[model samples]
Target chain A: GAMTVLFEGCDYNHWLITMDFSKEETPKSPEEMVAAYEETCAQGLGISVEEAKQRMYACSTTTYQGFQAIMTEQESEKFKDLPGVVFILPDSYIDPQNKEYGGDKYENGVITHRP
Target chain B: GAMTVLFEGCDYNHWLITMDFSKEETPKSPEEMVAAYEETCAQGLGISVEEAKQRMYACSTTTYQGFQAIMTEQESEKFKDLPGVVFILPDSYIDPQNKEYGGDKYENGVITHRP
Candidate 1:
């Protein structure tokens, strides 16, 4: 799971699946981008598109293209083969203990914000 | 606005208000943490607690402590004086063209993911 894999201390039921629509020569519309996320999520979860839509809690199309959806460890693996997926990470948290002043670091499966 | 201030190309109506609850000697309860976010967000946005709840779109108490809510560029400046706020960034997007694989970079107020 991305929670343990990328963010050691953080854990959640949903995975933040990010995609790269620009890889295609033609640009995808905002709706198309969202649909791509939902369709890919449905395929990865092995569920219906309607179910995927309901399961997905958030979708971002402006700054990035991605969706956050609930899935199990086994189901998450299916995304590696899904089209348009560029990054697959678990929905994570920023530790309250991380209150130091420095910089934000993403390494060793941990996201540390020194601010 | 944090949108233009941090992420130049991205834009949104809600600001991502992240807090460091560990700053206090005693850890805050999950419900208290949420209350703090709501209260501070209300103060910053200059709205009532009830209105804040209605305006806030998301809240995170596990990995981090914060909430997302609609506010104007002028209203966003008030957060600097709000208690417990460690980071106040506008909700941003990841460009679909960000398809190259390398490293994630946050420089000059831009979040670029090379993955």
Candidate 2:
């Protein structure tokens, strides 16, 4: 089975893209794997590194969902073909005034995949 | 007091599990400290790196809480024993669409432990 995880907040906005090497029929070289990873990020996130970095800086000190939406578009596009799940957060999870600070508001059992 | 911070979004999933080193009774070396940290991540999140990696990829492009729950489980377990607080984020903090793009959502005073 394969899965991907994404997370965003005020101080930082980043996601974790992962694949199960053991589940794969063949192994991939580190460079190849990284290339695939970078492509996934670029294509899925829908922004160049420069754009992502710039957005990160713009929202560095505040809390807003608009900034995150841009990043999500690319992420959704990249992983659309892969088998995985998505996680979305609500305002209650993060510090209202300061996005950099917050807690985990998710309930357990949401990620279990049914065949 | 000790604290653990977790963040999630559409395009990214990452977290900073931190503790107040100054309050500890004894000090551990970097190697020892890292071992504890790694153990914490493993036990709390309840995830093998491979599974984590995949979910990270799918959710890699957008915002969703489905992804963060996976990481939060392991994190919660890792810090279960430590005197600390768990931070959960909401959609208001992160943009509704992109996981890696958003603001800090957890409420501020909630992190301050009164007990």
Segments in model 2 whose C-alpha atoms lie over 4 Å from true places: A1-12, A46-115, B1-115
Q: Best candidate, DockQ-wise?
A: 2
Interface RMSD in angstroms for candidate 2: 13.0
Interface RMSD of each: 12.3, 13.0
State the lDDT of candidate 1 residue by residue for B1-49, as single tens digits: 5656552443457666667665567878866877787788778888888
User: Where does candidate 1 clash, by residue pair?
Assistant: A6-A109, A63-B93, A63-B94, A64-B93, A64-B94, A93-B63, A94-B63, A102-A114
> Isolated chain A: TM-score per model?
0.68, 0.33
The TM-score obtained by chain A of candidate 2 when compared with the true chain A: 0.33
Model 2: per-residue lDDT, tens digit, B14-107?
5533332223467555434433444444445665544433322111111221112224434444543644323233222234365442211222
lDDT of 2 by residue, A7-95 (tens): 44444234333333323457555444433444444455566744433332111101111112224433444654543212322212233
The candidate maximizing TM-score is 1
